Design an enzyme around this catalytic site. Sequence first.
Site, PDB file in Angstrom:
ATOM      1  NE  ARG A  59     -49.122  35.213  19.242  1.00 55.98           N
ATOM      2  CZ  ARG A  59     -48.211  35.950  19.668  1.00 55.98           C
ATOM      3  NH1 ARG A  59     -47.080  35.559  19.957  1.00 55.98           N
ATOM      4  NH2 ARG A  59     -48.506  37.153  20.082  1.00 55.98           N
ATOM      5  CG  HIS A  70     -37.250  38.367  23.032  1.00 52.32           C
ATOM      6  ND1 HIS A  70     -36.277  38.227  23.825  1.00 52.32           N
ATOM      7  CD2 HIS A  70     -37.995  37.387  22.793  1.00 52.32           C
ATOM      8  CE1 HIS A  70     -36.286  36.779  23.826  1.00 52.32           C
ATOM      9  NE2 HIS A  70     -37.490  36.228  23.253  1.00 52.32           N
ATOM     10  N   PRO A  71     -37.406  42.518  20.460  1.00 55.26           N
ATOM     11  CG  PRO A  71     -37.988  42.503  18.120  1.00 55.26           C
ATOM     12  CD  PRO A  71     -37.810  41.682  19.314  1.00 55.26           C
ATOM     13  CG  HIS A  84     -45.458  47.554  16.552  1.00 51.97           C
ATOM     14  ND1 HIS A  84     -46.678  46.925  15.918  1.00 51.97           N
ATOM     15  CD2 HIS A  84     -44.939  47.265  17.833  1.00 51.97           C
ATOM     16  CE1 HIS A  84     -47.087  46.458  17.450  1.00 51.97           C
ATOM     17  NE2 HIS A  84     -46.282  46.730  18.412  1.00 51.97           N
ATOM     18  CD  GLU A  85     -41.220  47.319  19.691  1.00 49.05           C
ATOM     19  OE1 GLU A  85     -41.301  47.928  20.844  1.00 49.05           O
ATOM     20  OE2 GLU A  85     -41.535  46.175  19.634  1.00 49.05           O
ATOM     21  CD  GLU A 133     -47.817  44.912  20.945  1.00 51.67           C
ATOM     22  OE1 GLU A 133     -47.762  44.731  19.756  1.00 51.67           O
ATOM     23  OE2 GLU A 133     -46.893  44.939  21.708  1.00 51.67           O
ATOM     24  CD1 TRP A 193     -55.603  21.507  23.762  1.00 51.98           C
ATOM     25  CD2 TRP A 193     -56.310  23.561  24.580  1.00 51.98           C
ATOM     26  NE1 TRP A 193     -55.015  22.424  23.256  1.00 51.98           N
ATOM     27  CE2 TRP A 193     -55.021  23.552  23.849  1.00 51.98           C
ATOM     28  CE3 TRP A 193     -56.656  24.563  25.175  1.00 51.98           C
ATOM     29  CZ2 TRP A 193     -54.727  24.904  23.454  1.00 51.98           C
ATOM     30  CZ3 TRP A 193     -55.939  25.823  24.925  1.00 51.98           C
ATOM     31  CH2 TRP A 193     -55.133  26.170  24.133  1.00 51.98           C
ATOM     32  CE  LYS A 250     -55.814  24.516  17.711  1.00 53.60           C
ATOM     33  NZ  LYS A 250     -54.904  25.624  18.159  1.00 53.60           N
ATOM     34  CG  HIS A 287     -48.255  35.058  24.976  1.00 58.85           C
ATOM     35  ND1 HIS A 287     -47.555  34.735  24.110  1.00 58.85           N
ATOM     36  CD2 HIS A 287     -48.114  36.544  24.957  1.00 58.85           C
ATOM     37  CE1 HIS A 287     -47.074  35.604  23.192  1.00 58.85           C
ATOM     38  NE2 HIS A 287     -47.429  36.753  23.774  1.00 58.85           N
ATOM     39  N   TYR A 296     -54.761  40.547  22.184  1.00 56.85           N
ATOM     40  CA  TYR A 296     -54.076  40.521  20.792  1.00 56.85           C
ATOM     41  C   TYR A 296     -55.735  40.268  19.990  1.00 56.85           C
TER      42      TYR A 296
END
Lengths: 193, 597
Positions: free
Chosen positions: B255, B327-328, B356-357, B384, B459, B463, B487, B497
Amino acid sequence: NLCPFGEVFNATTFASVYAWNRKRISNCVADYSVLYNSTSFSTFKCYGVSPTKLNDLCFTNVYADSFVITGDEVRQIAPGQTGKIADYNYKLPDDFTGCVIAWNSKHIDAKEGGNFNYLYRLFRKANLKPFERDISTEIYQAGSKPCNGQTGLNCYYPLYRYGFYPTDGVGHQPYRVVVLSFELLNAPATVCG
Amino acid sequence: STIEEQAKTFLDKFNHEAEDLFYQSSLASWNYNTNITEENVQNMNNAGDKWSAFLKEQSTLAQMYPLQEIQNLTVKLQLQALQQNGSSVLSEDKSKRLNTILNTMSTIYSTGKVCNPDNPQECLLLEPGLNEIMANSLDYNERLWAWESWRSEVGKQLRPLYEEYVVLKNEMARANHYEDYGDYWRGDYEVNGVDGYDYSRGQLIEDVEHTFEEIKPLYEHLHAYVRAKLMNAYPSYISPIGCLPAHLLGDMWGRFWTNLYSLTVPFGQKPNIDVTDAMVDQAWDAQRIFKEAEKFFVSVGLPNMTQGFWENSMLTDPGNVQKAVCHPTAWDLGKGDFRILMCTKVTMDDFLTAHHEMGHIQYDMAYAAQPFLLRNGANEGFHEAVGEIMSLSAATPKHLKSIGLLSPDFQEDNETEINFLLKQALTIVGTLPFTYMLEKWRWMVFKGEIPKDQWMKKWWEMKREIVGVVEPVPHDETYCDPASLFHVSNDYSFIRYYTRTLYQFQFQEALCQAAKHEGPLHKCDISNSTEAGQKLFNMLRLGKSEPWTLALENVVGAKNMNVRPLLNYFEPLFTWLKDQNKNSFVGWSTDWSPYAD
Ligand SMILES: *[C@@H]1O[C@H](CO)[C@@H](O[C@@H]2O[C@H](CO)[C@@H](O[C@@H]3O[C@H](CO)[C@@H](O)[C@H](O)[C@@H]3O)[C@H](O)[C@H]2NC(C)=O)[C@H](O)[C@H]1NC(C)=O
Ligand SMILES: *[C@@H]1O[C@H](CO)[C@@H](O[C@@H]2O[C@H](CO)[C@@H](O[C@@H]3O[C@H](CO)[C@@H](O)[C@H](O)[C@@H]3O)[C@H](O)[C@H]2NC(C)=O)[C@H](O)[C@H]1NC(C)=O
Ligand SMILES: *[C@@H]1O[C@H](CO)[C@@H](O[C@@H]2O[C@H](CO)[C@@H](O[C@@H]3O[C@H](CO)[C@@H](O)[C@H](O)[C@@H]3O)[C@H](O)[C@H]2NC(C)=O)[C@H](O)[C@H]1NC(C)=O
Ligand SMILES: *[C@@H]1O[C@H](CO)[C@@H](O[C@@H]2O[C@H](CO)[C@@H](O)[C@H](O)[C@H]2NC(C)=O)[C@H](O)[C@H]1NC(C)=O
Ligand SMILES: *[C@@H]1O[C@H](CO)[C@@H](O[C@@H]2O[C@H](CO)[C@@H](O)[C@H](O)[C@H]2NC(C)=O)[C@H](O)[C@H]1NC(C)=O
């Protein structure tokens, strides 16, 4: 010399907004310079007279309206700017001769469990003319079909209850409000500073 | 006596009843997440069930108002959110079975452990053990063991659970008048009612594919560069024309290529910018760090943080005595209660994520006067994206210099700039093919186009072609590698994202144009710009009242997502890569594999 006249201002508890309270004040020495150095009033503005002349004036009749409302709704206690409080709960006459007072109670009216003792009206048939009350628990039914019996699909119970927690934002913390109004008459009573 | 007035009173009752119930649920869940006890988890679940029951009652009530007869777009939206049958359109027993397998998948993912066969006493879970290997190990065989152990253990368990998850979810959405679970998800971007700003559900595929096509060349050159640099790191294991082995990408799945910076650094002679050493040395108050973010946000015309935030937020690790979830997260509890939950350490990564938060919190603080059901981002990507524009501005060396953690050396070679841009690409463009492919594979599975007997075949075929990544060992249909991501196994959509990455650079370009910035976009710091602050607040205040397309046009002037901000942000690195790969292979081979026969 008989009336501090603030048994109203600072006390144990007040009344709900839809059932606001009136009190007569008479035979008093109104000194308001010590109250200028009191807990800061969120808002203290006068409409008919001068805050720098208050004690000099000797008016006849004085009345006091005390009740509790939310923080964002507090700025509705004024002529015009009709809103939720300014119509369904407590309206002021457009011609107003008096002063309005409000302060913030951090944890007096707010408890960790939460305070559910103050009520307020959300649904009413018509806007209230100045200085009116309507405490009737009439199930509001705007849709033609008048349930009238209990809670209904299109019916609603017109009275809602404040929730006041000690972790709330400033916009809806318990604000405590007192309104002073001097009716204009050609008849004397005993008040002066 | 009109239906609209009746609907208005119904919505008034819902907002005033739901504000308090949501606040109680949020307080309970906060007490759990900051203080893990059995009493707290039971109180959280009690409050959550109360909230769900109230919502379903209001849903069956709101379904009694014929939507078609509503002429007020704002109210029609609130009613629509409430009329959604959601999971309720499932039978009771079938819904129970779905929730059971969902919780089971979440549990085995967050609890799965793999043990070393040579020493069965060493066992690691995903965090921090397996992640530590995938981030720092330079040993090909150790990384391959980690990759294969994680997948072949937990994903094999997840396989049958995931089959049942797919079939039940596609049916529900269909019962909720959608084609599949992806179509339900695609409904988040759907706009229906505003003339000139509507936007259909297939246009998302059209737009995503048309834009990934334009991203394709930049990713190809970065892929070629990283491939050569990795050949120097793993000799005899990587073909100069083949896909990248999946277990050498920097984490368990690829990721993010963040940990490849040490292996791909263009100019290692320049000091790579790490302010962590400066932070520890400078007098440090974790309070002051979060305060510095607060000072940043006020400098652009936004309000301070609330006294409730500073008193109720958890800004330090509570220790061994008090276990919490680290976890933030940025909590919008309602009733003006805003908190941040973060076990902050004195680190550079945490500095940007604190920005960010707190950007989330500013979004959350905004649109507060909107009705309940409109307290949400324009779409799933806006929050986000906002946090990320904050973190970029904080990451610029000009801002870092102005705050005093960097001496005013003001060294900025044409090599210091390329280093920073290369590290950004490892993160920003490395995640785009991953995100697009995962959601593309998931969408097709929901559509029923990938037979059950070729989940992994298709898959890994997909990929190879899109991301240019090849598996180190073969996997039959006994394995289940897609469910090996958090996720996917926790029922979260993933395309947010992709969309947020594009949105954030659109916003960055716009706000830097507002700040009259002139140099390269990546050197832009929107600090001290009340004009940019107002333009962002002008968008923040809408919540979900206006369509996201209209909200996006209000700030950037375009009704749709755009790739030119990202490409202009990365243009210098693009030309540098094009030069660096002149004698390197560009493109991928759909046929080379590490294993043979
Ligand atoms: C309502 O609020 C409080 C009771 O909680 C009272 O406020 C104050 O009362 C004290 C005496 O009990 C006053 O202290 C005094 O200060 C003056 C100089 O300012 C001094 O001359 C006195 O000897 C005494 O030390 C305080 O000033 C006073 N503050 C105000 C704003 O009045 C108040 O008596 C209560 N009264 C009512 C009607 O609610
Ligand atoms: C759809 O319905 C909403 C109501 O929920 C409409 O919004 C509302 O717009 C009116 C007119 O601007 C607002 O009334 C005004 O309130 C201010 C309060 O200070 C008052 O001073 C004015 O005299 C006026 O009465 C109302 O507050 C506002 N309500 C909300 C919740 O925003 C909306 O316009 C409707 N949509 C369309 C397309 O008409
Ligand atoms: C990054 O910055 C460096 C300098 O800080 C730039 O480098 C320089 O590149 C020029 C060519 O564009 C070089 O000029 C040439 O010198 C050789 C002899 O060395 C001569 O034969 C050629 O005819 C030409 O005049 C220059 O020497 C070189 N300087 C250094 C210190 O390397 C570089 O171009 C910059 N990169 C980008 C993308 O802007
Ligand atoms: C974690 O939850 C416990 C209750 O499960 C909270 O309780 C503490 O225990 C009693 C309970 O009345 C209090 O009087 C103590 O003062 C608390 N102990 C402390 C604060 O150390 C506890 O407060 C919760 N922890 C946090 C951080 O909220
Ligand atoms: C952007 O904002 C910062 C806020 O810190 C400004 O910093 C102040 O700058 C003035 C003038 O240089 C100094 O006198 C103060 O001591 C600084 N305060 C600090 C460092 O906290 C900065 O100058 C601004 N830059 C501009 C206007 O572009």
